[PDB]
Design a binder for these strands. Structure first.
Ligand code: ATP
Length: 295
RNA sequence: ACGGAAACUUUCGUAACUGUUUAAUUCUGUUCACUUAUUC
């Protein structure tokens, strides 16, 4: 499998509320875009039977600035791995920056566990604008933008085949998150040849102090042993559904999954949960497959 | 089958009303058109 490289600028990626926005984005945001364009193109009965093929998976948002970036491990270092806090004045001034850290570089994935505390590089500044609506007198909303600079890209790793190359190629001329009606979500698809020789520790078999990402959800069956002696971080993601027959826009059920970079100790399974409020002619399904890293 | 769908910071209104580039001011102070000469 290969990987896709794309960048964003002057876009919008909300989180929780329409007026609020963040830098990265969840993993289920990409999967919800390929299904919408499959019915419009003419292959709805072909993309549904491809995502549930086990070997086909997706990733979350990862920055790309002169090298790939990886999230920090949750829980590391522990109380014994970290150095002894002899002087509390010199430890509290550097331990707070590790909690607010976003992502780590590709050359610091092996030295962070031995003792390395530094400030993360600033990706982009948060910019916001304002609009209104004349001929109404009674509407004033606030929206934000994600204007990236200093060469900031958000690559994605998927399973390259003879059908995926024709699906995500037309996505750059559309939108992905934020105000799509204005033109927030366009990117530039860039393909290469030989992937990175360093980030090749992705497997789904053994479980020897691994770490699952992509903000996946564990299976409903095995959970007592997988969650035991582990860590996670609950998030928040909800919203209305996409349909054309219903005239009420029902609110979908929330799916408080985990976060990226959560360490565990047992191989998960990764199933497909069905979320249906009342009734819909289509089918709302969740993806987010876990990906383990050897660390 | 996307915290996404739906949206003009819009209409508004001479940078304007009075004001001599002028007040003071001899293109003139000195200056033979001439030295020499029988209309017989
Ligand atoms: N009066 C108090 N008694 C006990 N604990 C306190 C009191 N005031 C604050 N704290 C503790 O201090 C913590 C907040 O620390 P704070 O964020 O102010 O550190 P900081 O000033 O940012 O550190 P630095 O200056 O190194 O950045 C809280 O978790 C709280 O438990």
């Amino acid at each position: 499998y290969k990987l896709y490289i794309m960048t964003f600028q002057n876009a919008h990626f909300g989180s929780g509320t329409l007026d609020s926005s963040k830098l990265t984005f969840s993993a289920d945001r990409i999967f919800s875009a390929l299904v919408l364009e499959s019915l419009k193109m003419g292959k709805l009965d072909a993309f549904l039977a491809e995502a549930n093929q086990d070997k086909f998976t997706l990733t979350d948002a990862f920055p790309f600035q002169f090298g790939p970036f990886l999230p920090k491990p949750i829980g590391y270092p522990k109380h014994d791995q970290i150095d002894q806090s002899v002087d509390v004045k010199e430890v509290r001034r550097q331990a707070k920056l590790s909690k607010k850290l976003q992502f780590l570089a590709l050359e610091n994935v092996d030295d962070y566990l031995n003792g390395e505390l530094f400030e993360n590089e600033e990706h982009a500044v948060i910019d916001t604008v304002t609009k209104n609506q004349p001929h109404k007198d009674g509407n004033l909303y606030q929206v934000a933008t994600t204007r990236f600079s200093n060469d900031t890209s958000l690559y994605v790793i998927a399973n390259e085949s003879d059908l995926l190359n024709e699906l995500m190629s037309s996505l750059q001329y559309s939108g992905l998150g934020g105000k799509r009606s204005s033109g927030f979500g366009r990117f530039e698809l860039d393909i290469q040849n030989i992937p990175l020789e360093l980030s090749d520790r992705l497997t789904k078999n053994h479980s020897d102090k691994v770490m699952s990402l992509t903000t996946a959800l564990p299976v409903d069956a095995d959970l007592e042993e997988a969650m035991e002696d582990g860590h996670y971080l609950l998030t928040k993601s909800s919203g209305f559904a996409f349909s054309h027959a219903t005239n009420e826009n029902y609110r979908k059920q929330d799916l408080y999954k985990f976060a990226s970079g959560s360490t565990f100790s047992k191989t998960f399974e990764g199933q497909i949960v069905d979320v249906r409020p009342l009734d819909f002619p289509h089918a709302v399904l969740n993806y987010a497959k876990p990906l383990f890293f050897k660390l």
